[PDB]
Structures are given as C-alpha cells and as structure tokens.
Amino acid sequence: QVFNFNAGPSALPKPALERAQKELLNFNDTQMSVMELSHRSQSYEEVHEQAQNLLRELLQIPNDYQILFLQGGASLQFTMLPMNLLTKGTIGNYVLTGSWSEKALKEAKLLGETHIAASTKANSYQSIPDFSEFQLNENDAYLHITSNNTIYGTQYQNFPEINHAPLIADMSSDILSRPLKVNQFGMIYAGAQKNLGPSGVTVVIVKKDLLVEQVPTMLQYATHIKSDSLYNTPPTFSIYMLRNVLDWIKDLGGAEAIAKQNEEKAKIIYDTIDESNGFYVGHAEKGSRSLMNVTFNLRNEELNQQFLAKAKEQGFVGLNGHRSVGGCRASIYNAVPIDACIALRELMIQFKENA
Amino acid sequence: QVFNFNAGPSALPKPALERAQKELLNFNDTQMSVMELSHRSQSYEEVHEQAQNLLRELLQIPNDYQILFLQGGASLQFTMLPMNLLTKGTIGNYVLTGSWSEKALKEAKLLGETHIAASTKANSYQSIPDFSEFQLNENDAYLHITSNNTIYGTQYQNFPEINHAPLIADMSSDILSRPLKVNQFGMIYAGAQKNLGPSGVTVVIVKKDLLNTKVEQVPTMLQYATHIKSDSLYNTPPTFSIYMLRNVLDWIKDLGGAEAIAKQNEEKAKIIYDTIDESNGFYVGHAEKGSRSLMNVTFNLRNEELNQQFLAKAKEQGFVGLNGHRSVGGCRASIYNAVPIDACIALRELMIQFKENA
Numbered sequence A: 001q002v003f004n005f006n007a008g009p010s011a012l013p014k015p016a017l018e019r020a021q022k023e024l025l026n027f028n029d030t031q032m033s034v035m036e037l038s039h040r041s042q043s044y045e046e047v048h049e050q051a052q053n054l055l056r057e058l059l060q061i062p063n064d065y066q067i068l069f070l071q072g073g074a075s076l077q078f079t080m081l082p083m084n085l086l087t088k089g090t091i092g093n094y095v096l097t098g099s100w101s102e103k104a105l106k107e108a109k110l111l112g113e114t115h116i117a118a119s120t121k122a123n124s125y126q127s128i129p130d131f132s133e134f135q136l137n138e139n140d141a142y143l144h145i146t147s148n149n150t151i152y153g154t155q156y157q158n159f160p161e162i163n164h165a166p167l168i169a170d171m172s173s174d175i176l177s178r179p180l181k182v183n184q185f186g187m188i189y190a191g192a193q194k195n196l197g198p199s200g201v202t203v204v205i206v207k208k209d210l211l212v213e214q215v216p217t218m219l220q221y222a223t224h225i226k227s228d229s230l231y232n233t234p235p236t237f238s239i240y241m242l243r244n245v246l247d248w249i250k251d252l253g254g255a256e257a258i259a260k261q262n263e264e265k266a267k268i269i270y271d272t273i274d275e276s277n278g279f280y281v282g283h284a285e286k287g288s289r290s291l292m293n294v295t296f297n298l299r300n301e302e303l304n305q306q307f308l309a310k311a312k313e314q315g316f317v318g319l320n321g322h323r324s325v326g327g328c329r330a331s332i333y334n335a336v337p338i339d340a341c342i343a344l345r346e347l348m349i350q351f352k353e354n355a
Numbered sequence B: 001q002v003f004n005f006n007a008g009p010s011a012l013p014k015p016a017l018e019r020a021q022k023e024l025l026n027f028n029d030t031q032m033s034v035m036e037l038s039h040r041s042q043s044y045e046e047v048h049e050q051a052q053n054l055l056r057e058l059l060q061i062p063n064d065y066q067i068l069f070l071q072g073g074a075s076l077q078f079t080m081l082p083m084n085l086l087t088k089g090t091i092g093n094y095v096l097t098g099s100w101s102e103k104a105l106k107e108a109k110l111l112g113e114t115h116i117a118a119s120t121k122a123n124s125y126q127s128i129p130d131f132s133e134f135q136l137n138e139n140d141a142y143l144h145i146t147s148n149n150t151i152y153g154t155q156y157q158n159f160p161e162i163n164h165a166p167l168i169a170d171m172s173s174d175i176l177s178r179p180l181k182v183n184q185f186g187m188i189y190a191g192a193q194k195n196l197g198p199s200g201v202t203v204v205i206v207k208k209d210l211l212n213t214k215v216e217q218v219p220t221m222l223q224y225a226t227h228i229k230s231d232s233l234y235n236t237p238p239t240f241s242i243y244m245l246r247n248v249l250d251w252i253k254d255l256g257g258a259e260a261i262a263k264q265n266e267e268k269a270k271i272i273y274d275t276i277d278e279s280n281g282f283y284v285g286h287a288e289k290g291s292r293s294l295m296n297v298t299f300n301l302r303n304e305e306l307n308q309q310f311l312a313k314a315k316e317q318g319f320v321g322l323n324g325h326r327s328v329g330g331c332r333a334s335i336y337n338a339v340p341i342d343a344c345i346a347l348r349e350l351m352i353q354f355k356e357n358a
C-alpha cells in the first residue's frame, strides 16, 4: 500500500497514466510515441490544441483570453510577469499570504517599484487578509495574489473585485480544483505538476489585450500568444499528459464534480484534526483553510517525528511539512483519491489512540 | 511501414521507450510513476545524478565543468548566455553558419554589442567558414558557434582553438553524436529533443568558474549561478524529461558510447550521400561536401514540382519528416543517433526508385 501525498510533483489520475502507458510506443496509429513527433506535425498540433480546448471548456475561459503553455515553472513567471507589465512609473503590488507570495514579490523588486497591498506575514500567514484592507495605488501595474499558499495551507475562498489594474494569481496549487470566474483576472498561471499534469509545463491564462521592446523574445508573452505556444519546441509529452489529465477531469463531470470530491477529501482530514481534542492542530485559521494542502502539527516535535515515521512505514509519501515550517502537510490535489485520505484519517486515529 | 526522419522532436531508441513503458506506473518499486515523485525523493535524485554521470562518462566531461538541466529550450539559452556574460564594454561575437546562428545573434543584440566573426550567409550557408577567416576582438565576451546547422545540413568537422574568450556552442542537433573535447569550450548547450530524447529539458555543460558568480540585475531563474549552486533543482525540474534523457544515455553507453555511435552515424549518412552523389544530379545536396552534416541531410530535386512529387511519394510510403524546414524548402533527412540504419536503406530505395521512374 502506497498513499501519494506529494506536494509537487504529485499524484496523477490512474486512467491518465494507464492511457499514456498503453500508447507510449504507438500514438494514434502513427507507430511513433507522442515523444517522437515533430511539434510542427498535425499529430502533435491536435494534442496541443485539444489541451487548450479542454482547459477552455473546463474553466469556462472566455474568448478574449489566450491559453499559453510555457516552460520554466511558476518561478519563471515570477520574473516574466513584471518583465512584461511592470513598466516605468508603475507599481507591482503584491498581497502576501505565504512564502510563494514572497518569492514572486522578490523577483518584481529587481525590475521596478513594488508595494505590499496587504500581508498576514506578522501572524505567520494563518489567514487570507480582508479585502477591505488592501492598499491600492492608481499607478499599480497589477495586483498579484497567491490563490493557494502551498506551504501554509491557506486559500482564497473568493477573489477581490479589482478594477484599477489587472488581478494576477499564482494558482499553482489550486488551479482547476473548483470552478473559477476567469473574468476576475488579467492573468492566471500555474506549473502543471500539482493539479494538471507532470512537471515541465506551465499554464498561463492571459487576457489577450493586456499583453515590449527590449524584452528578450522568449520572455515576451506576445511571442507565445502570436505563435500559439509553438514559437520554439514545447514540452510535448508534458502537454500530452496535461491533455490526458484534463480528459479525466472532464469524464468525472468537470470543475464542479472535482470540487465536490476535493471538499470531501479535505473534510475527512479537517474533521479528524478538529475531533482530536488538540492532539493534531492545524496551522490555518478555519476560515482560510486550504482544500489542497492541509497543514498541521502534533503537540511537540518528538511526536511530530514519531507520527511522520509511522506514516512513512505504513506507505504514506510526502507528508513531511515544508522545511521552512516543519510539522505535517497532506497535499490533496485533484488526483489524490478519497481512499488515501480515509487511510490517512485511520492512521491518525490509531496513532492518537496508541499515544 | 513507418520511417521516422523527424527533425525535432525525433526518433528515440526503442529500448529507452520500452523501459519507460514498462515502469510508467511503478518506478523503482515505489508504486508511483517517475512523473508522480518528488524531485527530492531518493528515487528521482538517483535518476538526476545518473543522467549527469552518464553524460560525464560518455563525453569525458572534466571535473571543473558542471552539467545543468534547464527548461526553456536552446532558444532560452540564446538570451540567457548574453544576459550572464555580455557585460558592458564587451562583445558577443558570432559565427553565422545557418538560421539558428542568426537567431542566437538576434538575442544578443538586444542585450549588448555584437559582432560577426565570420559568415557564409551570402552563399546561403553551404559551408563552414575557414577558421582563418574569424574576426576576433580583444573585448569579446565569448565566441559563439552552431556546431550543426540543422536547417542547412552543414556541420563543423572540428572546433577552433580560442584563447581570448570562451568558445560557446549551440550543439542542439549533434551533441553526443561523436567524441568531443569539451575543454575547448566554456559552455555547450543543446535542447535534448534532437539527439538525446525528450523535449522539455536543455542540457547545458558549463565551465563552473566562468558562470558560477552572481550577475547583478539578472533575475534569479536566469542566472547560471542559481542553477549551478542548486544542481538544477532550484525549482521543480522536468523530471520525466530528465528520466527519459537518462534512459537514452544508458542506450548510448550500451551501444559503445560516442566512438561507436559515430561509426554508426557515419555509415548511415554515407548511405544517403552516396545515393545523392550517384544520382547524376537528380538529387542535389545543399551542403558543400567538406561541410556535410552527419545529422541532417539537406537536398533538392531539379525543380519544385519534382520536390513535391518526391515528398508526396515519401509520405505515401510511410516516411515522416522529410519536408525541408519551412524557411528553405527542399528535403531534409534527419538521421540523429536513434534513427535506424534500415530507415536510411529504405530512403535510398525510395530515392532510387523515384529517380528511375521519373
């Protein structure tokens, strides 16, 4: 028995992997792997387009947005965004809700004026700040948020109505885990390796008209928009796998259906914490609790380590919290099945009963 | 019948793919795919390290060089190289031997002073210029070359001895197709998808002391130092692509390494160039003979109607990828390491029959 709670890269749907295995040597009767196709072939172009189409359908992405498939991870987006939009006399305004927010802010500071609209850093990122607290500037280039704060286990329940500058979100750890109103954003980005696919491709959803002389060709959004993410060779297998994952989400009923599964998964772990009479304590304020990364600790470090060691012995993978914060983190992205969360509960109850 | 002459991504050695298929769901007894593992797991770390160690052994990479695995393609390297080394007061000096050379130069121009050391552009890139032609500057930041000019079908036979600045090479389409004296270079880069397997990873072989220092003003992800210090694990790497690279490198080693693959590549290139040369001008190769690539064989028939008819027949007969690059037309047989010799035999037979029946 293995239970895959890895935080990134992460569990993928079994049907998507089984499909990939079956046709790894002979894709679509071509007698070649999808990995052996030219990216300028109709065979590959169909897959590329179908990944975009499924994202568009599943997230209900309006026609005035384009869907980009880029290399470099979300971390490259931390610099590519200000490189394109943080122009002279404008401000890259950030809401800090965890360490990933901080890493994005850091890259903008190298390129122009920045600002902190709001922050829960002083309280160790236990919550999402009230939107009424945001400090906005007329010359903001954008307002950047982190929808799901992967290390801290907090998540935006809803998104602010921002009209003075585009809203930009790092959705790496919760994209397509629930329906979204894409019209609230100027740009959304996410490495694929938590909810959408394997590592090596980054999805960027951008309002077309939003997006640069002096910027290197590969680092302009415009390059990729105009070329439909085929300016240079894309990560063809990663985009194929993304397509397979998106087919799986569609087959189960789409974003509302996966949201219901993810809410049940999270409920199992949070009820276990809440009913534990303080033996397990979550990091996040209840009102900010993530459905994607559940962070918690036991009453002392010795017990934390004992629990994590027992989990590892019993086949659980990935539960150690991020190094920077310690404790435990159960990552329960889309393809983590409910039975793994049940198994984690049962382990948690047995461990407490035998403590 | 399928014959895969795709130019990028391209044929993989079947055992690398069969290995990946077999263990796609349960890698190293973990009951997870390599695609589902942490990059900090022992199972992945072993793959990441073995890929480096296989490249090191196969190319005889000295210990003062590091192997980086980066995202972004060779195209991102066209900007990352000048961003890190083209400093104020210095020149990015380029040898133009094809379109990919031009694309690299274009990115440097956005960032600093550039120069053209030598060029065969005026003659449509039929050859590699003689090294005696190279115009060097005392303030060169580097001299950049393209070892195999993938669109034009020409290739360096050997490499210049440069002492005034580091020699940098885009080796995307011929890396590890033959032995290489890595110590001639300050940096070598290659998208993996021509001769080393997967798209989505770029191999960068760097002389550590040339590039391990922070570069003021350059974004974290775009500094070589970031990736050198973190062993290409600064952010999440393209784990499946690096895994597949490992599998391809295991295959190259198994077949006898760089020396053995060179022998194989020379043989299968000769099959196609002999067909051209014995065709009494029915097929005309683009490259001058002294510069002919072992990796991309470029040619035309006597007019565009015949080119179209040949390519249409090829496709009907199961050949994939023979259309020349859009920018130049004609035909291009890409014959990277993993293209089997019997595909080259089949192409010869197609070419002879088409000639005879024309």
Ligand SMILES: *Cc1c(COP(=O)(O)O)cnc(C)c1O
Pocket: A008, A072, A073, A074, A075, A076, A100, A146, A148, A149, A150, A170, A171, A172, A173, A191, B235, B236, B237
């Ligand atoms: C996973 C993660 C990242 C880092 O992504 P890379 O692809 O490794 O650069 C960035 N932001 C958030 C919120 C993450 O969860």
Ligand SMILES: *Cc1c(COP(=O)(O)O)cnc(C)c1O
Pocket: A232, A233, A234, B008, B072, B073, B074, B075, B076, B100, B146, B148, B149, B150, B170, B171, B172, B173, B191, B194
């Ligand atoms: C394939 C190729 C490139 C482009 O590589 P990408 O990974 O698509 O950016 C650059 N240089 C040469 C010589 C090539 O053959």
Ligand SMILES: [Cl-]
Pocket: A097, A098, A099, A100, A101, A148, A149, A150, A151, A152
């Ligand atoms: Cl975080």
Ligand SMILES: [Cl-]
Pocket: A007, A008, A150, A151, A322
């Ligand atoms: Cl994280």
Ligand SMILES: [Cl-]
Pocket: B097, B098, B099, B100, B101, B148, B149, B150, B151, B152, B153
């Ligand atoms: Cl070229």
Ligand SMILES: [Cl-]
Pocket: B007, B008, B150, B151, B325
């Ligand atoms: Cl090419």
Ligand SMILES: [Mg+2]
Pocket: A124, A125, A126, A127, A152, A153, A154, A283, A284, A285
């Ligand atoms: Mg918290």
Ligand SMILES: [Mg+2]
Pocket: A247, A250, A251
């Ligand atoms: Mg379906």
Ligand SMILES: [Mg+2]
Pocket: A271
């Ligand atoms: Mg209850």
Ligand SMILES: [Mg+2]
Pocket: B250, B253, B254
């Ligand atoms: Mg071996």
Ligand SMILES: [Mg+2]
Pocket: B340, B342
């Ligand atoms: Mg055969």
